[PDB]
Coordinates of C-alpha atoms and ligand atoms in Angstrom, one line a residue:
Chain A
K1 CA -50.5 19.3 -41.2
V2 CA -52.5 22.3 -39.9
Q3 CA -53.7 24.6 -42.7
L4 CA -55.9 27.7 -42.8
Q5 CA -57.3 28.3 -46.3
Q6 CA -58.8 31.7 -47.1
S7 CA -61.2 32.6 -49.8
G8 CA -59.9 34.4 -53.0
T9 CA -59.5 38.0 -54.0
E10 CA -62.7 40.1 -53.7
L11 CA -63.6 43.2 -55.9
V12 CA -66.5 44.9 -54.2
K13 CA -68.4 48.2 -54.8
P14 CA -68.5 51.0 -52.2
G15 CA -71.5 50.7 -49.9
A16 CA -71.8 46.9 -50.3
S17 CA -70.7 44.1 -47.9
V18 CA -68.3 41.2 -48.3
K19 CA -68.0 37.9 -46.4
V20 CA -64.5 36.4 -46.4
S21 CA -63.9 32.8 -45.2
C22 CA -61.1 30.8 -43.4
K23 CA -61.2 27.0 -43.7
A24 CA -59.3 25.1 -41.0
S25 CA -58.1 21.6 -41.3
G26 CA -55.6 19.2 -39.7
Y27 CA -56.8 19.8 -36.1
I28 CA -59.8 19.8 -33.8
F29 CA -61.5 23.0 -34.9
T30 CA -63.5 23.9 -31.7
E31 CA -60.4 24.0 -29.5
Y32 CA -58.5 27.0 -31.0
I33 CA -59.3 30.7 -31.0
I34 CA -59.2 32.3 -34.5
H35 CA -58.1 35.9 -34.9
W36 CA -58.4 38.3 -37.9
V37 CA -55.8 40.9 -38.8
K38 CA -55.9 43.7 -41.4
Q39 CA -52.9 44.9 -43.5
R40 CA -52.9 47.8 -46.0
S41 CA -50.4 47.6 -48.8
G42 CA -47.8 45.3 -47.2
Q43 CA -47.1 47.5 -44.2
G44 CA -48.7 47.8 -40.7
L45 CA -50.8 45.3 -38.8
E46 CA -54.2 45.9 -37.1
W47 CA -56.0 43.4 -35.0
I48 CA -59.8 43.1 -35.7
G49 CA -61.1 40.5 -33.3
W50 CA -61.2 36.8 -32.3
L51 CA -63.8 34.0 -32.3
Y52 CA -63.8 30.8 -30.2
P53 CA -65.6 28.1 -32.2
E54 CA -66.6 25.8 -29.3
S55 CA -69.2 28.1 -27.8
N56 CA -68.9 31.0 -30.3
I57 CA -67.5 33.6 -27.9
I58 CA -66.4 36.6 -29.9
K59 CA -64.3 39.7 -28.9
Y60 CA -63.9 42.8 -31.1
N61 CA -61.5 45.6 -31.4
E62 CA -63.7 48.6 -30.7
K63 CA -62.4 50.3 -33.9
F64 CA -64.0 47.4 -35.8
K65 CA -67.2 46.8 -33.8
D66 CA -69.4 48.5 -36.4
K67 CA -67.4 47.3 -39.4
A68 CA -66.7 43.5 -38.8
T69 CA -69.0 40.6 -37.9
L70 CA -67.4 37.3 -37.0
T71 CA -69.3 33.9 -37.4
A72 CA -68.3 30.3 -37.5
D73 CA -69.7 27.0 -39.0
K74 CA -68.5 24.1 -36.9
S75 CA -69.8 21.5 -39.4
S76 CA -67.5 22.8 -42.1
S77 CA -64.6 24.0 -39.9
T78 CA -64.9 27.5 -41.3
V79 CA -64.7 31.0 -39.6
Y80 CA -66.2 33.9 -41.5
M81 CA -65.5 37.6 -41.4
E82 CA -68.2 40.0 -42.8
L83 CA -67.3 43.6 -43.6
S84 CA -70.1 46.1 -44.2
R85 CA -70.7 49.6 -45.6
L86 CA -67.5 49.3 -47.6
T87 CA -65.1 52.2 -48.6
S88 CA -61.6 52.4 -50.1
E89 CA -60.3 52.6 -46.5
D90 CA -61.3 49.0 -46.2
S91 CA -59.1 47.9 -49.2
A92 CA -56.4 45.7 -47.5
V93 CA -55.1 42.1 -47.1
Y94 CA -57.1 40.4 -44.3
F95 CA -55.4 37.4 -42.6
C96 CA -56.9 34.8 -40.4
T97 CA -54.5 33.1 -37.8
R98 CA -54.7 30.4 -35.2
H99 CA -53.6 31.2 -31.6
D100 CA -52.4 28.2 -29.6
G101 CA -52.4 29.6 -26.1
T102 CA -48.8 30.9 -26.6
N103 CA -48.8 32.7 -30.0
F104 CA -50.3 32.9 -33.5
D105 CA -48.8 29.6 -34.9
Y106 CA -50.6 29.2 -38.2
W107 CA -51.8 31.9 -40.7
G108 CA -54.0 31.9 -43.7
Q109 CA -52.5 33.1 -47.0
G110 CA -54.4 36.4 -46.8
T111 CA -57.5 37.6 -48.8
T112 CA -57.2 40.8 -50.9
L113 CA -60.2 43.1 -50.8
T114 CA -60.4 45.9 -53.3
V115 CA -63.2 48.4 -52.9
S116 CA -63.8 50.1 -56.3
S117 CA -66.6 51.4 -58.6
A118 CA -64.7 50.3 -61.7
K119 CA -65.6 47.6 -64.3
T120 CA -63.2 45.2 -66.0
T121 CA -61.2 47.3 -68.4
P122 CA -58.3 46.2 -70.6
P123 CA -55.1 48.4 -70.6
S124 CA -54.1 50.7 -73.3
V125 CA -50.5 50.0 -74.2
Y126 CA -48.1 52.6 -75.6
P127 CA -44.6 52.2 -76.9
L128 CA -42.0 54.5 -75.3
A129 CA -39.2 55.5 -77.8
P130 CA -36.4 58.1 -77.1
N131 CA -24.3 55.9 -75.1
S132 CA -23.6 52.2 -75.6
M133 CA -26.9 51.4 -74.0
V134 CA -30.5 52.6 -74.8
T135 CA -33.5 52.5 -72.5
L136 CA -36.9 51.9 -74.1
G137 CA -40.3 51.6 -72.4
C138 CA -43.9 50.5 -72.4
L139 CA -46.8 52.5 -70.9
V140 CA -49.7 50.4 -69.6
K141 CA -52.6 52.7 -68.9
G142 CA -56.2 52.7 -67.7
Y143 CA -56.8 49.0 -66.7
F144 CA -59.0 47.3 -64.0
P145 CA -58.4 45.1 -62.1
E146 CA -54.8 44.1 -61.2
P147 CA -52.8 42.3 -62.3
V148 CA -51.1 42.7 -65.7
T149 CA -48.1 40.7 -66.8
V150 CA -45.4 42.5 -68.8
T151 CA -42.7 40.7 -70.8
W152 CA -40.2 41.8 -73.4
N153 CA -39.8 39.9 -76.7
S154 CA -42.1 37.1 -75.5
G155 CA -39.9 36.7 -72.4
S156 CA -36.7 36.3 -74.3
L157 CA -35.5 39.7 -73.0
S158 CA -35.3 39.4 -69.2
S159 CA -32.2 41.3 -68.0
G160 CA -32.1 45.1 -67.6
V161 CA -35.9 45.2 -67.1
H162 CA -37.7 47.3 -64.5
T163 CA -41.5 46.8 -64.3
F164 CA -42.9 49.3 -61.8
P165 CA -45.8 48.9 -59.3
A166 CA -49.2 50.1 -60.5
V167 CA -50.6 53.4 -59.3
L168 CA -54.4 53.8 -59.0
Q169 CA -55.5 57.0 -60.6
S170 CA -59.2 57.9 -61.0
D171 CA -60.4 54.3 -60.4
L172 CA -58.0 52.8 -63.1
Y173 CA -54.4 51.4 -62.8
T174 CA -51.3 52.6 -64.8
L175 CA -47.7 51.2 -64.9
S176 CA -44.6 51.5 -67.1
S177 CA -41.8 49.0 -67.8
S178 CA -38.3 49.9 -69.0
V179 CA -35.8 47.8 -70.8
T180 CA -32.1 48.8 -71.2
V181 CA -30.4 47.1 -74.1
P182 CA -27.2 47.6 -76.2
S183 CA -27.6 50.5 -78.6
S184 CA -26.2 48.4 -81.4
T185 CA -29.2 46.1 -81.1
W186 CA -32.0 48.7 -81.4
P187 CA -33.5 49.9 -83.7
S188 CA -31.8 47.5 -86.1
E189 CA -33.4 44.6 -84.1
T190 CA -37.0 44.4 -83.0
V191 CA -38.0 45.2 -79.4
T192 CA -41.6 44.4 -78.4
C193 CA -43.5 44.6 -75.1
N194 CA -46.1 42.0 -74.5
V195 CA -48.9 42.8 -72.0
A196 CA -51.4 40.3 -70.6
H197 CA -54.5 41.2 -68.7
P198 CA -56.2 37.9 -67.4
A199 CA -59.4 39.6 -66.2
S200 CA -60.3 40.9 -69.6
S201 CA -58.7 37.9 -71.4
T202 CA -56.6 40.2 -73.5
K203 CA -52.9 40.1 -74.6
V204 CA -51.4 42.8 -76.8
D205 CA -48.0 43.2 -78.5
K206 CA -46.4 46.6 -78.9
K207 CA -43.3 47.1 -81.1
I208 CA -41.0 50.0 -80.2
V209 CA -40.5 52.0 -83.3
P210 CA -38.1 55.0 -83.8
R211 CA -39.9 58.4 -83.9
Chain B
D1 CA -55.2 50.9 -25.0
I2 CA -51.5 50.2 -25.6
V3 CA -49.6 52.1 -28.3
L4 CA -46.3 50.6 -29.5
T5 CA -43.7 53.0 -30.8
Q6 CA -41.2 51.1 -33.0
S7 CA -38.0 52.7 -34.3
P8 CA -36.4 53.3 -36.7
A9 CA -39.0 53.0 -39.4
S10 CA -36.3 52.0 -41.8
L11 CA -32.8 50.6 -41.3
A12 CA -29.9 50.2 -43.8
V13 CA -27.4 47.6 -42.4
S14 CA -24.2 46.2 -43.9
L15 CA -23.9 42.4 -44.2
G16 CA -22.2 41.1 -41.1
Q17 CA -23.0 44.1 -38.9
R18 CA -25.5 44.4 -36.0
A19 CA -29.1 45.7 -36.3
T20 CA -31.0 46.9 -33.2
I21 CA -34.8 47.6 -33.4
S22 CA -36.6 49.3 -30.5
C23 CA -40.2 49.2 -29.2
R24 CA -41.6 51.6 -26.6
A25 CA -45.0 50.9 -25.0
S26 CA -47.3 53.7 -23.7
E27 CA -47.8 51.5 -20.6
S28 CA -46.4 48.3 -19.1
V29 CA -46.9 45.1 -21.1
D30 CA -45.8 43.1 -18.0
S31 CA -48.1 41.1 -15.7
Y32 CA -47.7 38.1 -13.4
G33 CA -43.9 38.1 -13.8
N34 CA -43.9 37.9 -17.6
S35 CA -43.5 40.5 -20.5
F36 CA -46.2 39.9 -23.1
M37 CA -44.2 41.4 -26.0
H38 CA -43.6 39.4 -29.2
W39 CA -41.5 39.9 -32.3
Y40 CA -42.4 39.0 -35.9
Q41 CA -40.8 38.9 -39.3
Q42 CA -42.7 39.5 -42.6
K43 CA -41.5 39.2 -46.2
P44 CA -43.7 40.4 -49.3
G45 CA -46.6 38.2 -50.2
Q46 CA -46.2 36.2 -47.0
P47 CA -47.9 36.2 -43.5
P48 CA -45.8 37.4 -40.5
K49 CA -43.6 34.8 -38.9
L50 CA -42.9 34.6 -35.1
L51 CA -39.2 35.1 -34.0
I52 CA -39.5 35.7 -30.3
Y53 CA -42.3 35.2 -27.7
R54 CA -42.6 36.9 -24.4
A55 CA -39.7 39.3 -24.9
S56 CA -36.9 36.8 -24.8
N57 CA -37.9 33.3 -25.8
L58 CA -36.5 32.2 -29.2
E59 CA -39.0 30.3 -31.3
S60 CA -37.9 26.9 -32.6
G61 CA -36.2 27.1 -36.0
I62 CA -35.1 30.7 -35.5
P63 CA -31.3 31.2 -35.4
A64 CA -29.7 32.6 -32.1
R65 CA -28.5 35.5 -34.3
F66 CA -31.9 36.9 -33.2
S67 CA -32.1 38.1 -29.6
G68 CA -34.8 39.9 -27.7
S69 CA -34.7 41.8 -24.4
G70 CA -36.3 44.4 -22.2
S71 CA -39.1 44.7 -19.8
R72 CA -42.0 46.9 -18.8
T73 CA -42.2 49.5 -21.6
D74 CA -38.9 49.3 -23.4
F75 CA -37.9 46.4 -25.7
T76 CA -35.2 45.6 -28.2
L77 CA -34.8 43.0 -31.0
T78 CA -31.1 42.5 -31.9
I79 CA -30.0 40.8 -35.1
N80 CA -26.3 40.0 -35.1
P81 CA -24.8 39.3 -37.6
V82 CA -27.3 40.3 -40.4
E83 CA -27.5 37.4 -43.1
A84 CA -29.1 38.6 -46.5
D85 CA -32.2 36.5 -45.6
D86 CA -32.9 39.1 -42.9
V87 CA -34.2 41.6 -45.5
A88 CA -37.8 42.0 -44.3
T89 CA -40.1 44.1 -42.2
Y90 CA -40.1 43.6 -38.4
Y91 CA -43.0 44.0 -36.0
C92 CA -43.4 44.2 -32.2
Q93 CA -46.8 43.1 -30.8
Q94 CA -48.2 43.2 -27.2
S95 CA -50.6 40.7 -25.7
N96 CA -50.8 42.1 -22.2
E97 CA -54.1 43.9 -22.9
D98 CA -56.9 44.1 -25.4
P99 CA -57.0 45.3 -28.1
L100 CA -53.8 43.5 -29.4
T101 CA -51.6 46.1 -30.9
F102 CA -48.5 46.1 -33.2
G103 CA -45.7 48.6 -33.8
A104 CA -45.7 50.3 -37.2
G105 CA -42.8 48.1 -38.4
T106 CA -39.1 48.4 -39.2
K107 CA -38.0 47.8 -42.8
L108 CA -34.6 46.3 -42.9
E109 CA -32.6 47.0 -46.1
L110 CA -28.9 46.4 -47.0
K111 CA -26.2 49.0 -47.4
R112 CA -24.2 49.3 -50.6
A113 CA -22.0 51.9 -52.3
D114 CA -23.8 55.1 -53.5
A115 CA -25.0 55.0 -57.1
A116 CA -26.4 57.9 -59.3
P117 CA -29.7 57.3 -61.1
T118 CA -29.7 56.5 -64.8
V119 CA -32.3 58.9 -66.1
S120 CA -34.3 58.6 -69.3
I121 CA -37.2 60.6 -70.6
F122 CA -40.0 59.7 -73.1
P123 CA -42.4 61.9 -75.2
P124 CA -46.1 60.8 -75.6
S125 CA -46.5 58.1 -78.3
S126 CA -48.3 59.2 -81.5
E127 CA -50.9 56.5 -80.7
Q128 CA -51.7 58.1 -77.3
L129 CA -51.9 61.5 -78.8
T130 CA -54.3 60.1 -81.4
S131 CA -56.8 59.3 -78.6
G132 CA -56.4 62.7 -77.0
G133 CA -54.1 62.1 -74.0
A134 CA -50.4 62.8 -73.5
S135 CA -48.2 61.1 -70.9
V136 CA -44.6 62.0 -70.4
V137 CA -42.5 59.3 -68.7
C138 CA -39.2 59.6 -66.8
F139 CA -37.3 56.6 -65.5
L140 CA -34.8 56.9 -62.6
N141 CA -33.0 53.6 -62.6
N142 CA -30.5 51.7 -60.4
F143 CA -29.8 54.3 -57.6
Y144 CA -28.5 54.2 -54.0
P145 CA -29.5 55.4 -51.5
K146 CA -33.4 55.4 -51.4
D147 CA -33.9 59.1 -51.0
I148 CA -34.5 60.9 -54.3
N149 CA -36.3 64.0 -55.6
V150 CA -38.0 64.3 -59.0
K151 CA -38.9 67.6 -60.6
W152 CA -40.8 68.3 -63.8
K153 CA -40.3 71.5 -65.8
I154 CA -42.4 72.6 -68.8
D155 CA -40.9 75.5 -70.7
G156 CA -38.6 76.3 -67.8
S157 CA -41.5 76.2 -65.3
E158 CA -41.8 73.7 -62.4
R159 CA -44.9 71.5 -62.7
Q160 CA -46.4 69.7 -59.7
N161 CA -49.9 68.7 -60.7
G162 CA -50.6 65.6 -62.9
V163 CA -47.4 63.8 -61.7
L164 CA -47.5 60.2 -60.5
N165 CA -44.5 58.4 -59.1
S166 CA -43.8 54.7 -58.6
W167 CA -41.0 53.4 -56.5
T168 CA -39.4 49.9 -56.4
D169 CA -38.3 48.1 -53.3
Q170 CA -34.6 47.2 -53.0
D171 CA -33.4 44.9 -55.8
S172 CA -32.1 41.7 -54.2
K173 CA -29.3 41.2 -56.7
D174 CA -27.7 44.7 -56.7
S175 CA -29.2 46.5 -53.6
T176 CA -30.3 49.5 -55.7
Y177 CA -33.7 51.3 -56.1
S178 CA -35.6 52.4 -59.1
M179 CA -38.4 54.9 -59.7
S180 CA -40.8 56.0 -62.5
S181 CA -42.4 59.4 -62.8
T182 CA -45.3 60.1 -65.2
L183 CA -46.8 63.4 -66.1
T184 CA -50.2 63.3 -67.7
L185 CA -51.6 66.3 -69.6
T186 CA -54.2 66.7 -72.3
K187 CA -53.1 66.7 -75.9
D188 CA -54.1 70.4 -76.2
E189 CA -51.8 71.3 -73.3
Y190 CA -48.9 69.2 -74.5
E191 CA -49.1 70.8 -78.0
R192 CA -49.0 74.3 -76.3
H193 CA -45.4 73.8 -75.0
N194 CA -42.0 73.0 -76.6
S195 CA -39.5 72.0 -73.9
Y196 CA -40.0 69.1 -71.4
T197 CA -37.6 68.2 -68.5
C198 CA -37.3 65.6 -65.9
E199 CA -34.8 66.4 -63.1
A200 CA -33.3 64.2 -60.4
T201 CA -31.8 65.3 -57.1
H202 CA -29.7 62.7 -55.3
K203 CA -26.9 62.4 -52.7
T204 CA -24.3 61.3 -55.4
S205 CA -24.1 64.7 -57.2
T206 CA -24.2 68.4 -56.3
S207 CA -25.9 69.1 -59.6
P208 CA -29.2 67.6 -60.6
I209 CA -29.3 64.9 -63.4
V210 CA -31.4 66.6 -66.1
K211 CA -33.0 64.7 -69.0
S212 CA -35.0 66.7 -71.6
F213 CA -36.7 66.8 -75.0
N214 CA -38.2 69.4 -77.4
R215 CA -41.7 68.5 -78.8
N216 CA -40.6 69.8 -82.3
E217 CA -37.5 67.5 -82.0
Chain C
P1 CA -26.0 15.6 4.1
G2 CA -28.5 18.1 2.5
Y3 CA -30.5 16.1 0.0
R4 CA -34.2 16.6 1.2
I5 CA -37.0 18.2 -0.6
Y6 CA -39.0 19.9 2.1
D7 CA -42.1 20.7 0.0
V8 CA -43.5 21.6 -3.4
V9 CA -46.0 24.5 -3.4
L10 CA -48.3 26.0 -6.0
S11 CA -49.3 29.7 -6.2
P12 CA -52.2 30.3 -6.5
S13 CA -52.9 27.1 -4.6
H14 CA -56.7 26.9 -5.1
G15 CA -59.8 28.7 -6.4
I16 CA -58.5 29.7 -9.8
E17 CA -61.3 30.9 -12.0
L18 CA -60.8 32.2 -15.5
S19 CA -62.8 33.3 -18.6
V20 CA -62.0 32.4 -22.2
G21 CA -59.0 34.5 -23.5
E22 CA -57.6 35.3 -20.0
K23 CA -54.0 34.5 -18.9
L24 CA -53.2 31.6 -16.6
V25 CA -49.8 31.9 -14.7
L26 CA -49.0 29.3 -12.1
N27 CA -46.0 29.4 -9.8
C28 CA -44.4 26.2 -8.5
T29 CA -41.9 26.4 -5.7
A30 CA -39.7 23.6 -4.5
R31 CA -38.0 24.3 -1.2
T32 CA -35.0 22.1 -0.5
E33 CA -31.8 21.5 1.4
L34 CA -28.5 22.9 0.1
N35 CA -27.1 20.0 -2.0
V36 CA -30.3 19.2 -4.1
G37 CA -30.7 19.6 -7.9
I38 CA -34.3 19.8 -9.2
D39 CA -35.9 18.9 -12.5
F40 CA -39.6 20.0 -12.9
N41 CA -42.3 18.2 -14.8
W42 CA -45.8 19.6 -15.4
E43 CA -49.0 17.8 -16.2
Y44 CA -51.9 19.9 -17.6
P45 CA -55.4 19.0 -19.1
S46 CA -55.1 20.5 -22.6
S47 CA -53.4 18.6 -25.5
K48 CA -53.1 22.0 -27.4
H49 CA -49.8 22.8 -25.9
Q50 CA -46.1 21.8 -26.1
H51 CA -44.5 21.7 -22.6
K52 CA -41.6 23.8 -24.0
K53 CA -43.8 26.9 -24.7
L54 CA -45.8 26.8 -21.5
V55 CA -42.9 26.3 -19.0
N56 CA -40.3 28.9 -18.3
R57 CA -36.9 28.4 -20.0
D58 CA -34.8 30.7 -17.7
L59 CA -33.2 29.5 -14.5
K60 CA -35.2 30.6 -11.4
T61 CA -33.4 29.8 -8.1
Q62 CA -32.8 31.3 -4.7
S63 CA -30.3 30.4 -1.9
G64 CA -30.6 31.6 1.7
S65 CA -29.6 30.1 5.1
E66 CA -29.1 26.4 4.5
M67 CA -32.0 26.2 2.1
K68 CA -32.7 26.6 -1.6
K69 CA -35.9 27.5 -3.5
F70 CA -36.4 26.4 -7.2
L71 CA -39.2 28.2 -9.1
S72 CA -41.0 26.9 -12.2
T73 CA -43.8 28.8 -14.0
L74 CA -46.5 27.6 -16.3
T75 CA -48.1 30.3 -18.5
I76 CA -51.0 30.0 -20.9
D77 CA -51.7 33.3 -22.7
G78 CA -55.4 32.9 -23.7
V79 CA -57.2 30.0 -22.1
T80 CA -60.0 27.9 -23.6
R81 CA -62.4 25.3 -22.1
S82 CA -59.9 22.5 -22.7
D83 CA -57.5 24.3 -20.3
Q84 CA -60.0 23.6 -17.4
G85 CA -58.8 20.8 -15.2
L86 CA -56.0 19.7 -12.9
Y87 CA -52.5 21.2 -13.1
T88 CA -49.8 19.1 -11.4
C89 CA -46.2 20.3 -10.8
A90 CA -43.7 17.5 -9.9
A91 CA -40.2 18.4 -8.6
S92 CA -37.6 15.6 -8.9
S93 CA -34.1 15.5 -7.2
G94 CA -33.2 12.0 -8.6
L95 CA -33.6 10.6 -5.0
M96 CA -37.3 11.6 -4.7
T97 CA -40.2 13.4 -6.5
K98 CA -42.6 15.6 -4.6
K99 CA -45.7 17.1 -6.3
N100 CA -48.7 19.4 -5.8
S101 CA -51.9 20.1 -7.6
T102 CA -54.6 22.7 -8.2
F103 CA -57.9 22.8 -10.2
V104 CA -58.3 25.6 -12.7
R105 CA -61.8 26.5 -13.9
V106 CA -62.5 28.2 -17.3
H107 CA -66.0 29.9 -17.5
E108 CA -67.6 30.3 -20.9
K109 CA -67.7 34.1 -21.2
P110 CA -65.3 36.5 -22.8
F111 CA -62.6 37.9 -20.5
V112 CA -63.2 41.5 -19.2
Ligands
LIG301 C1 -45.0 34.2 -9.4 O1 -43.7 34.6 -8.9 C2 -43.2 35.9 -9.3 C3 -42.1 36.2 -8.3 O2 -41.0 35.4 -8.6 C4 -44.3 37.0 -9.4 O3 -44.0 37.8 -10.5 C5 -43.4 39.1 -10.3 O4 -42.2 39.1 -9.4 C6 -41.3 40.1 -9.7 C7 -40.1 39.9 -8.8 O5 -39.7 38.6 -8.8 C8 -42.1 41.5 -9.4 O6 -41.2 42.6 -9.8 C9 -43.4 41.6 -10.1 O7 -44.1 42.7 -9.8 C10 -44.3 40.3 -9.9 N1 -45.5 40.4 -10.7 C11 -46.7 40.7 -10.3 C12 -47.0 42.2 -10.1 O8 -47.5 39.9 -10.0 C13 -45.7 36.5 -9.6 O9 -46.7 37.5 -9.3 C14 -46.0 35.2 -8.9 N2 -47.4 34.8 -8.9 C15 -48.2 34.6 -7.8 C16 -49.6 34.7 -7.9 O10 -47.7 34.3 -6.7
NAG302 C1 -49.0 21.1 -1.3 O1 -49.4 22.4 -0.9 C2 -50.2 22.5 0.3 C3 -50.7 23.9 0.4 O2 -49.8 24.9 -0.1 C4 -49.2 22.2 1.4 O3 -49.9 22.3 2.7 C5 -48.6 20.8 1.2 O4 -47.5 20.7 2.2 C6 -48.0 20.6 -0.2 N1 -47.6 19.2 -0.4 C7 -46.4 18.9 -0.7 C8 -46.2 17.4 -1.1 O5 -45.4 19.6 -0.7
CA303 CA1 -71.1 53.3 -34.2
CA304 CA1 -48.7 25.6 -31.6
CA305 CA1 -55.0 50.6 -21.0
CA306 CA1 -31.3 15.8 4.9
CA307 CA1 -66.9 29.6 -8.6
CA308 CA1 -57.1 39.0 -25.0

């Protein structure tokens, strides 16, 4: 099977550079042109350039001529993309993809680049207290980087949950999660949000208590 | 340098009906008797997936529900009938000329019956206030269609600054949307006011859905 | 009777010279008598490609006087060095096969 395997998520400071890799396997590496494609926040595609490994011919989108540098290592079947002088405008998913002479036929899984000045910061977690149904909440504020995991009652409470996408505000992320439950069950039974933040190795529990 | 204009940006289709997506190119994408126009599908977390190459050739494994046509500068992807697995973003792409270029994308969502938001409002926790911040949270849950307006009022006065909104994509199970709205103030400011109001304007009602609290209870 | 293949002709027929990333589009025309059916079969140098994606899927025919033409096209969008070589188009009627060839060169420079 043909596979393209991309390097993992990168968190890089503004002004610095990053070098992202695409490892090819399952085919003769030198024979196929490899292209790079940029996507910001799951919508829109922008072509960056291609590299032909056999003789290392490279072609750039003029928009990326000063920003991207493409190289290859034949011995390890890897194509590299370097991105320099980074700013938040460069934060995106970067895909590598193989072209076969007809179309892009295999794609890497994407590499997330996040350009940020922030250091690892655990979230502050706040309980959100106020029909036959009552909505409760959990505010998860001021963390870096993504992601966090939010469960209710150690995952025992799954239905009627809406966990919202994070918004970046002043270098740090904030999200909320709502649960809607029968009013007969709260506050007479305990409702707790559990918030995990892998980067900081933290996990906190917050019990929703009546004001 | 070829610009692809794809429309509509978003499309809400009912299960079993037809969807038509258009791509207009700023100049011909034809040469040598071929049209170098391609169609892709992309779902969240995944790379794009080829549906149609050179305007009208169906990729192996793609159902014949998917159909492409056009030439020169005007192209159409038809999907007929729409299965629920078609919920995705669709892209046109030209390879007639460098740089390779894509259309902006068309997001395909499903139609359902209109549904008013369920709105809930929350005061700052005593723990947040203890640090020195004050966030006020409003949830606007399970609504259709997508278009909604959220307004904050503090003591009867519209507030615009310090507001952050977060929107969900369409829920795959019930075809509704959801949204949060958070207003962040200082503790000093929060303590200066009594009445707090989140207000939702939606297609379903002529009157806004208003949720409110008094800081003094 | 009307079962003869008159000729099989490639266009361009010679002197095709490409750079890496450029398009190759080759026309193959079989001129025949009125009653003939034609199946086309291409040979090409590169083992990168399925025949299905390179060769046209639509029917390309023409009738006029007491003759028919059958057109087959081979397209590679973005050639590489392994696409340099001999391209052969064979046209078969069941009774007979006629073929024609051309050499395609791929230079190692990016396409303009
Ligand atoms: C291969 O054959 C076709 C003709 O069948 C040529 O492609 C186009 O032909 C249509 C009409 O059939 C015209 O409208 C286009 O303008 C032609 N394309 C152009 C501008 O090249 C094709 O050119 C042929 N290739 C060669 C070199 O003979
Ligand atoms: C092959 O093409 C050449 C040049 O077009 C032509 O003279 C010749 O008749 C063709 N041969 C066949 C077998 O049709
Ligand atoms: Ca410059
Ligand atoms: Ca292929
Ligand atoms: Ca141009
Ligand atoms: Ca005869
Ligand atoms: Ca020469
Ligand atoms: Ca090109």
